[PDB]
Each structure stands twice: as C-alpha cells, then as structure tokens.
Design a protein around this ligand. Structure first.
Ligand SMILES: N[C@@H](CCCC[NH3+])C(=O)O
Ligand code: NA
Ligand code: NA
Ligand SMILES: [Zn+2]
Length: 866
C-alpha cells in the first residue's frame, strides 16, 4: 500500500459537472449505468484517471461512441485521447451481497444501502472519487417492488414508474453540486415516521425517519432531536436547512456512527432507536449529539466541503465543536465540558502519544478510513474552541459568516477557514495555524511567585511538545491559557497591570514567558487552564489544600471537578506505586473529607456532584503514567472505590435515597439527579456485601427505565456480587432478540473483573445474540474486551493478545475497517513493560504476515513495529 502526501495535492486534470446514475438493483448483481458530463482543465494530452475498486466493467462510451482508447490498471480506468468536453458513459456490475466490508453498496439485513465516505463511491462505479470534484447528481433506481418498496437517494423525487415482472423505479434529483462521498442510496421495506419542520424564514421541510418494520416505537426521540437540531442551528448559527425533505435511515449494519449524505443521512441504528426500557440517559444524549452532528454537517461539510481528505478536520473538528455547543446549550454545559475533557485527556492524549500520532491536518495517509480519529474529531474541536476563546462569540460568528460567504458551494481547506476567522475578527492567527501542522500534546509548566512587598503575582509559564514518531521537530504553539485568581474568601481578584485590566486568557506563545499582575492584595489560589482552555498537559505543583479550596470556591463548575481530578491524580499515582510493592491503599483523611463535603453540600448542582463522584476511568488513569501497569491501575481503582464506599457509607446511602425519582423523564434536571444516585450506587455496590447485594438486586428489579436497570446490572458485575449471575441471565432471557440492548450486556461481560473473563468472552462468540457479521456486536464484545478491559487484555500470560490476533485474522478479510478499530490496543505496546512489549510485538508480527493483509491494518502495524 502506497502513502499519499498532503504536499502532493494538485487540481484535477478533469472535472465532472453532472452525473446521471441508473441502478438496476439486485443483491447478487447490481448493474450501474453512469452518464457523466466532463470537462478537461489539464493538458490536452492528459488522460482521464478514474478510480474504481472491485467493479466488473461492461462498457465505455464517449459521446455514445464505444471507446477503444482505454485501459484498466490497479484501482483505475485510464481513458485516453479525449475531447475538451464530452459525455462519459460507464456500465459496470457490482455485488452488494458479497460486500462484507460495508463500503460502497452493501446489504444491511434485507435492505440495500451505501456508505461512500471516504472513498467508497469508487466501489460503485468508475469515477473521480476525490472531494474537490463536485457534480449535480440525478439517480434512477430500478428494483423489485415487493422486496424494495422504498427507493431513496439524495434530494427530491422527480420521476417514478412501474415496469413488467414486478419491478418499479424512482428517480431523484439533488440540485446542490456535491463530491461523491455524499452520495447515498437506500432500498428496502421500512416503517416511516413522518413529521415537519418550518424554518425561520418559512420553508416547510418534510422530515422522514425510516426504520426496520416494527421499530416505530423507538423513533420519536430521534425525530424530536432532529427538530431540536434544526431550531438550534437557526438560533445559534443563523443557519437554515436548504432542501424540501430531510431523510434519515436507521441501519443495523454500519461501521461508524452515522453519515451526513445530503438530504439522506444514513445512521447506525445505535444512534437512532430509543425507548425508556431499551435505552439509557447516555443513549438518549448520544442520539441527540449524533443527530445534531450529521445535521450540522449540512453547512459544515456539505455546503462547504473538503478540497482533499487531509482537510478532514475542516468539517469534523468544526462539526464536533457544533455538536458540543448544541448539547451544552440544551443540557448541562458543565457536564458536557467535563465529559469532553475526559475524552481528550484520556483517549486522545493516548493517541497523540502513540505510533499513530498525527496533526489534526495529517501530512501522510495510507488508508484514509484510519483517520476518522480522536485527533481529527475531538482535538479538531478543541482547536476550533481555542479560536472561539481567542475571538469571542461575536467575532467567531462573523468568521463563520465570512467562511460561508467565500466558500459556499465549494471545496475548501483548513487554511481557508482560519483565514476567514482571522479576516473577520482582525485577530492574528498566523502563529495559531501551527496547531494544524504539529502533532503531540504540549506540556505547559507553571511556576508562581507572590511578592507581598509589591503586591504582585508572577506566573512563569513554559511549554514544550515532546517529539512524536511522526515528527522530530516541534515548535512553540499559540496557547490560550485562561486563569482566575482567588483570595482567602474565595473571591475573584481582578487581573490588572500598570493600572489597566488584563485579559484572563493569557497568550502563551513562547517556550518560556512571565506574566506579572499588580494589586494582588492577598496571596492567590490560582485556577489554571480554566475550562481546559487549550488541549495541553498542565504541570503545576498544587498543594492538596489549594485543590480542596478550589473544589469549594471555584466559580465555574468545570474548575471544581478539575481540581478534584488533580487531587485524585496524586493519590492514584501513589497507590499504583504501592500496588507494585504489594502494599494496600493509603489515602489521607483530608482527601476522603473533600468527597464527603461534596456529598453533603446542599448547594452544589447534582450534575456536578455526580461527575466529581465518578472516578477517572482506567484509560484516564493510564495517561498519568509513562509506563502503564494495567493490573495495578484496575486494582487501585477498585481499592479506591471500596475505601470511599467504607468511609462514606452513611452519606452515600442518604444521597442515594434522597435522589430517588418515581417518574422517569429524559429531562436534564432529572438526568442529573439520576446520575448522582447511580454514582452513589456504584460505591455502595463495593461496600458491605449483603447490603450491596440487596440494594443492587432491588434496583435492577424495580427500575422503571434502562438507565437504572443497567446501573444496577453494571454494579453487580463490577463488584462481583452474589446476584450477578441471576441478573445477567434474566437480562439475556428478556433481551436476547434485541441486538442494541444486548450490546450493553456484551460490554459488561467483556469488561468484567472476573478471573475467567477471557474464557467467558471466547464462549460468547457462540452466543445467540452475537455475530461476526455485525460491527456493533463485534465492538461490544471483542472491542470492549481489548480496549476497555486492559487488565484482562494485558494478562501476563499473553492470552489477551492471542485472542485479539485470532479475531483480527478473521476481520482483516471480512471487514478491515472494524479490524483497524480493534487493533488499536495492540499498537500501544511501547507504553507497556518489556515482557508485555515482546508479546505484543510477536502478535503484531503474526498479523504483518497475513495473506491479503488489508491496507487498514498494514498502516497501523508498520507504524507500531517501527
Ligand atoms: N462523516 C461521518 C463519518 C464518516 C466515516 C468514514 N469512514 C461522521 O462524521 O459522522
Ligand atoms: Na445549557
Ligand atoms: Na510558587
Ligand atoms: Zn462528522
């Protein structure tokens, strides 16, 4: 597999302006006719190089003349000796039933559906499969009427007919030019939830949600979330939908989460289907986020698209930022920010410290599907948010407006977006641009001094980004570094120097710099990197008392949570070292007291209390360490939970009871109280065994919603309670027919602390609810084991690695994209001890030797073994 490089981008020799597709649909053999209007822009002697994969070419015509001047090569059809303008007609065959990779046109149960991003359209026909080629599409679909009563593509229906032998057809037209990655086709039999949204300016939009027959009871929340998304984009960004219909199709077989195809989004059913007995609060809020995300792409991705795939973050970072702002505006901003920071500091930082590290705008890509990453998405959004921090909302919106004014109807670059923000706001972002080109996590070190003679407070701030495998050279970034200073009363000290106020967002642009503040009338307790103002690691020598002070007094709820994290970090590190020495947990009384205070604080938002009372995950804990000891981390997390459960037993039970809710509502105040109640239950499960068992079994049986049922089930598994096996069997018996519900159960099995977890996981490959043909099942059982049970995955006998190798040997051939998701835990080998590294290296070498090794895996394996 050959690497492609950002610096090699060149405008295409040919454009296509219009394409008319006809599909003669059949699961075994689909015949595609594609009539494209093409224009040469390059040299008169330049051939047309069309991309195509696994196509059976039937014919090639140019202006209806059968063409002789062509050749097929690896991945391409090369057509020579062309006029400056011409009509290209290609007929080819494809086989949806044979498509196990789920890229291009494939089968999802009885439905046929497409996934074209990034480079899937070339699996459908020979085309200029690159996003700077935008064309107006017309799509005619012919199919068996009984099997495929609904025939959907982008845009509006412009024609329909019936044919002999039980076939029918529908033709669609989408007036907006698009790159082919936004093409979609769906054929099948569905229940359809129909609604309307009227835009601010009065455009009536038909909303249509297509689900498998029998799933209409699980559709209204997604529909509600779509309308919420439409309203919010109007209110916050001033953006309206631009077409007459908005279709969403929920499919069970889907590699990713969802896809923003123009006017015809295709969603993994996991991000559509919800009812109160099948879906948790988290599922509801995820459906809201993902519905919003795909909707927000209508402008940030579709109306303005990407010039090339290296510019992916142009749409993904900005659309993730938009989905975060949507969730934060409608729900709890503090909880959203906290959770997005957890994802950054734990999961994304790990990626930036791995062999797969890349800038948010990559420079080198072998398999583009490997770059739909935490970095491109989540760090991408942090970079957009830094622009927002530097500009303020007003200037940021002016930048958005200039961006659309300049680039509407075109394919643009990350740089185009930064330039729009810079030009609209008059804020210089030249240094800032380095965030797009530099990988790795900056480390920001802060030292301070208080001078009582002069009443001056001095911050000495330094930065450095360690070299990464992809980049030997690193330079200082423009880091927006937000601070607050607190006096002894917990009041904010005004920031000023020389009689003038100073902005609280410090511009940390050098390797080292000093900031001096005057009229600091008392030695401050600083809050640093407020609201995680830059995606960086903070090094500051906190005292425990400074941190507990912040937990009490910090103005922003995020700072209170963050102070608790800093406090915990010290004792997580202490106790991991102790574990390695065979010593039990040690925790100062005053640390337990800080958490007691949180439980008993009557003024604190339950949403915030719940997050403070949610311990960092084993992945968050891992990023506190250079070399990860996954067994020590798992056991310390459990020991910390048990210690807090014992010390806070009475308070935990009181708060658990106080937050009981008889009505179930998907409403933010209710969700907050329930999150707090279940956070308490988690500790209570790890307390005295009999009380724990009674509390947990009772909640499981009495729950009137899946949030509370699953919280109880999860606690029974985590604490290995007597009731565990009974409850797990009861859930299986009730829910085995429902794959999405069983995913939760597979996750609990895969992440179990039980000694025999791998044995159980292996056996579950034969479970009635499991299948290797379904990405969701694979991720929930195998993915969760390797990625979310690092203690078992990293068993010292190497059994975890061998299991993953067996699974990847299958998946490499079946579904390389899912295989590539699942190999990720293995490529982190350098974070582990020498003995584990050698077993992981051996596993990677075995995979490197596979017959027909996919490019997806090749890219990751080669980087890992370097
Ligand atoms: N554009 C989609 C992801 C496409 C995945 C391509 N392999 C989204 O952001 O949800
Ligand atoms: Na809000
Ligand atoms: Na100091
Ligand atoms: Zn997206």
């Amino acid at each position: 597999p050959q690497a492609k490089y950002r610096h090699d981008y060149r405008a295409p020799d040919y454009q296509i302006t219009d394409i008319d597709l006809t599909f003669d649909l059949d699961a075994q053999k689909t015949v595609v006719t594609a009539v494209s209007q093409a224009v040469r822009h390059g040299a008169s002697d330049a051939p047309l190089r069309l991309n195509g994969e696994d196509l059976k070419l039937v014919s090639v015509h140019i202006n209806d003349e059968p063409w002789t001047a062509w050749k097929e090569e690896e991945g391409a059809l090369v057509i020579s000796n062309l006029p400056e303008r011409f009509t290209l007609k290609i007929i080819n065959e494809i086989s949806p039933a044979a498509n196990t990779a789920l890229e291009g046109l494939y089968q999802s149960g009885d439905a046929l559906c497409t996934q074209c991003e990034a480079e899937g359209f070339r699996h459908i026909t020979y085309y200029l499969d690159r996003p700077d080629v935008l064309a107006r599409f017309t799509t005619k679909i012919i199919a068996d009427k009984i099997k495929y009563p609904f025939l959907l593509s982008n845009g509006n229906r412009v024609a329909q007919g019936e044919l002999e032998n039980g076939r029918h057809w529908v033709q669609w037209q989408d007036p907006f030019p698009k790159p082919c990655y936004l093409f979609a086709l769906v054929a099948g039999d569905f229940d359809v939830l129909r609604d309307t949204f009227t835009t601010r300016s009065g455009r009536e939009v038909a909303l249509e949600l297509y689900v498998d027959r029998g799933n209409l009871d699980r559709a209204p929340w997604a529909m509600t979330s779509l309308k919420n998304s439409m309203k919010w984009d109007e209110e916050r960004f001033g953006l309206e939908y631009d077409l007459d219909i908005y279709m969403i199709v929920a499919v069970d077989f889907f590699n990713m989460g969802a896809m923003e195809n123009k006017g015809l989004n295709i969603f993994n059913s996991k991000y559509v289907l919800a009812r109160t007995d099948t879906a948790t609060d988290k599922d509801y809020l995820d459906i809201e986020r993902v519905i919003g995300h795909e909707y927000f792409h209508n402008w940030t991705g579709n109306r303005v698209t990407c010039r090339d795939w290296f510019q992916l973050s142009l749409k993904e970072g900005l659309t993730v930022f938009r989905d975060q702002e949507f969730s934060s505006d409608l729900g709890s901003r503090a909880v959203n920010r906290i959770n997005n920071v957890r994802t950054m500091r734990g999961l994304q930082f790990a990626e930036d410290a791995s062999p797969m590290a890349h800038p948010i705008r990559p420079d080198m890509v072998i398999e583009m599907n490997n770059f739909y990453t935490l970095t491109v998405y989540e760090k991408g959004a942090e970079v957009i948010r830094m622009i927002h921090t530097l500009l303020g909302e007003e200037n940021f919106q002016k930048g958005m407006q200039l961006y659309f004014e300049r680039h509407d109807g075109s394919a643009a670059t990350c740089d185009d977006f930064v330039q729009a923000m810079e030009d609209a706001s008059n804020v210089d972002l030249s240094h800032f641009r380095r965030w797009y080109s530099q990988s790795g996590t900056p480390i920001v070190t802060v030292k301070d001094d208080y001078n009582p003679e002069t009443e001056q407070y001095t911050l000495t701030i330094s930065q450095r980004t360690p070299a990464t495998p992809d980049q030997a050279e690193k330079q200082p970034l423009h880091i927006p570094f937000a601070i607050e200073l607190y006096d002894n009363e917990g009041k904010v000290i005004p920031l000023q120097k020389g009689g003038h106020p100073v902005n609280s967002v410090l511009n940390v642009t050098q390797a080292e710099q000093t900031f001096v503040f005057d009229n600091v009338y008392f030695q401050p307790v600083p809050a640093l990197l407020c609201e995680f103002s830059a995606p960086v690691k903070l090094e500051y020598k906190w005292s425990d008392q400074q941190l507990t002070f912040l937990m009490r007094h910090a103005r922003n709820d995020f700072s209170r949570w963050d102070a608790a994290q800093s406090l915990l970090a010290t004792y997580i590190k202490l106790n991991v070292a102790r574990h390695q020495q065979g010593q039990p947990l040690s925790l100062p009384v005053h640390v337990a007291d800080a958490f007691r205070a949180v439980l008993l604080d009557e003024k604190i938002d339950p949403a915030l209390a719940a997050e403070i009372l949610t311990l960092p995950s084993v992945n968050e804990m891992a990023e506190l360490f250079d070399i990860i000891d996954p067994i020590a981390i798992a056991e310390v997390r459990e020991a910390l939970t048990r210690t807090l459960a014992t010390e806070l037993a009475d308070e935990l039970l009181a708060i658990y009871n106080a937050n009981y809710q008889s009505e179930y509502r998907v409403e933010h105040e209710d969700i907050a109280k329930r999150t707090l109640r279940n956070a308490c239950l988690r500790f209570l499960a790890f307390g005295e065994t009999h009380l724990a068992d009674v509390l947990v079994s009772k909640q499981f049986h009495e729950a009137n919603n899946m949030t509370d049922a699953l919280a109880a089930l999860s606690a029974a598994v985590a604490a290995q309670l007597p009731c565990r096996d009974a409850l797990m069997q009861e859930y299986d018996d009730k829910w085995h027919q429902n794959g999405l519900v069983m995913d939760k159960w597979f996750i609990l099995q895969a992440t179990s602390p039980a000694a025999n977890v791998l044995e159980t996981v292996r056996g579950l490959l034969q479970h009635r609810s499991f299948t290797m043909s379904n990405p969701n099942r694979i991720r929930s059982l195998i993915g969760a084991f390797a990625g979310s049970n690092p203690a078992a995955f990293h068993a010292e006998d190497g059994s975890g690695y061998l299991f993953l190798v067996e699974m990847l040997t299958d998946l490499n051939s079946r579904n390389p994209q899912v295989a590539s998701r699942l190999i990720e835990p293995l490529i982190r080998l350098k974070r582990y001890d020498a003995k584990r590294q050698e077993k992981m290296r051996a596993a990677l070498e075995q995979l490197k030797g596979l017959e027909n090794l996919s490019g997806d895996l090749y890219e990751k394996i080669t980087k890992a073994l370097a």
